[PDB]
Structure formats: structure tokens, C-alpha cells
Amino acid sequence: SQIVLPPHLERIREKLAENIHELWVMNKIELGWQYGPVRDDNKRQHPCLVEFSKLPEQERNYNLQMSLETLKTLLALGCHVGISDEHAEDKVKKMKLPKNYQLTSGYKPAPMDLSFIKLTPSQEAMVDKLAENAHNVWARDRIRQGWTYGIQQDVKNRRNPRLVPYTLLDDRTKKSNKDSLREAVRTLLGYGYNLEAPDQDHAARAEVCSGTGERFRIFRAEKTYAVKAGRWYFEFETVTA
Ligand SMILES: Nc1ncnc2c1ncn2[C@@H]1O[C@H](COP(=O)(O)OP(=O)(O)OP(=O)(O)O)[C@@H](O)[C@H]1O
């Protein structure tokens, strides 16, 4: 709420959301799966492969808000974005694909030259962090709608297994949204806007999370076993260093 969206990032973000949707639809296309009319997942049909003109208002809006929240949170991390080259919009090239790859909607997605990108490990860790943030946003929406966590998915009790912290999140959905956000940030880069991240911070948390009373536990022999003469020896195995 504190930060505000610059206009240029907006006039790029509408097409950012559009080509995120293009990513998703072509993921489906090369997976080979097709659209289905009826809102039934189990009936071997999928109501998501919808033309952008007939695309649900709520779904397009939900994508638009994830895009704005993603770019805004990226800015709020301390990352600052710069337009070094205006010529990206001129050099930007469509990949030629066979007509069979085009979906029934009639619009042809154009995935650009993402491969030329140079990627830094801080930037992948950052992309993972925003994937975590998107998962947190989704979990917050589910919780306020009333969904709770469960080991087994049940719509009647509104219990879902994916409502878990990102560290414990299943790798399937983790990579599933990781690739989408990776492509989003990748295209934001490819359009001539490079991002510059704040430097990584090193710190020692010391895993201090014990009770207030105890920070350490002291074990000892009984006082009656005190030795006052001689040579004595014992051993201490360290299971954890
Ligand atoms: N990894 C992903 N990348 C991009 N879009 C995704 C991804 N996973 C899901 N989506 C899309 O986002 C929306 C997810 O909402 P959905 O209807 O699946 O939620 P839900 O039924 O509340 O979920 P759940 O029952 O798993 O808690 C759908 O429009 C779906 O197509």
C-alpha cells in the first residue's frame, strides 16, 4: 500500500500479464491437452484454456493483480529497475512456430529471445522469494475465504493440502509457479528493463528459539561422586556439532 506503480511499468505490465497467460496456454498446448466446456476437472476436460476475449473477468483480474503485486513487491525489496536500452522494443523478435502450435483462440503467442539472458544466483533466489510471496498471498486469500489446511483435499470442509509454508510446499506446485514467475521476470528483463537488487545480507540467527527460562541444559554427575585424587577419564560423544 505504501508504494505506487510507475506509469511505464503499468504500460508494460498489461502485456506482461497477457504473455504470462500466453505462457500458460502454450504450456497446455505442448503438453497436448485441450479445452473442455463444462466446469469439471474430473470429467477429463479443462475450463481454463479460454480465449482471451471470452476469458473470465475474475480470472484475468486475478492475473493482473498478481502481476502488479509481483512487480511492486520486487520494487519493495529494495530492487530498482532501469531502462538502459529503448531499442529492446525494436530488436524484440517473434519466434516462428508451425501453425499446429497455434491454439483455437486464434491469437498467436510470441515468446521472445529469453535465452540471451545472463542470470545471477541472487536473481534466482529473488525469483524464488517472490514465488514464496505469491504463495503467501494465495494462502491468505484462501484463509480469509475460510479454507484450512488438511492432509487430504476436501471441498466440503474447505480443507486443502497446499495451504502450507513455502519451505514445506510440494515440489510439483513449487516448480509450477516458479517457472511462471521466472518467465514473468525474464520477460520484464527482455523488454529492456534490467533490475538491480540490493546486496545479500549475511547474519547469524544463532537459532535462538528456546524457552525464556533455559538457553542451555547442564548435565552432571552426582555430587557424591566427586573425585579428590587419582587419574580419571570419561568420554563425550557429540551427535550434533
Ligand atoms: N503454477 C501456476 N501458474 C500459473 N497459473 C496457475 C498456476 N496454478 C494455478 N494457476 C491458475 O490460477 C488459478 C488457481 O485457482 P484455483 O481455481 O486452482 O484455486 P482453488 O480451487 O482454490 O485451489 P486449491 O483447491 O488447490 O486450494 C487458476 O485460474 C489456475 O489456472
UniProtKB/Swiss-Prot annotation:
User: What up-regulates or down-regulates this gene?
Assistant: By TGFB1.
Q: Which domain of life is it from?
A: Eukaryota
Complex formation: Homotetramer. Can also form heterotetramers with RYR1 and RYR3. Interacts with FKBP1A and FKBP1B; these interactions may stabilize the channel in its closed state and prevent Ca(2+) leaks. Interacts with CALM and S100A1; these interactions regulate channel activity. Identified in a complex composed of RYR2, FKBP1B, PKA catalytic subunit, PRKAR2A, AKAP6, and the protein phosphatases PP2A and PP1. Interacts directly with FKBP1B, PKA, PP1 and PP2A. Interacts with SELENON. In cardiac muscles, identified in a complex, composed of FSD2, CMYA5 and RYR2.
Per the UniProt record, the associated disease is: Ventricular tachycardia, catecholaminergic polymorphic, 1, with or without atrial dysfunction and/or dilated cardiomyopathy: An arrhythmogenic disorder characterized by stress-induced, bidirectional ventricular tachycardia that may degenerate into cardiac arrest and cause sudden death. Patients present with recurrent syncope, seizures, or sudden death after physical activity or emotional stress. CPVT1 inheritance is autosomal dominant.
Regarding protein family, the annotation reads: Belongs to the ryanodine receptor (TC 1.A.3.1) family. RYR2 subfamily.
Q: What is known of its domains?
A: The calcium release channel activity resides in the C-terminal region while the remaining part of the protein resides in the cytoplasm.
Q: What name appears for this protein in its UniProt entry?
A: Ryanodine receptor 2
> What's the source species for this entry?
Homo sapiens (Human)
- Which gene is transcribed and translated to give this protein? RYR2
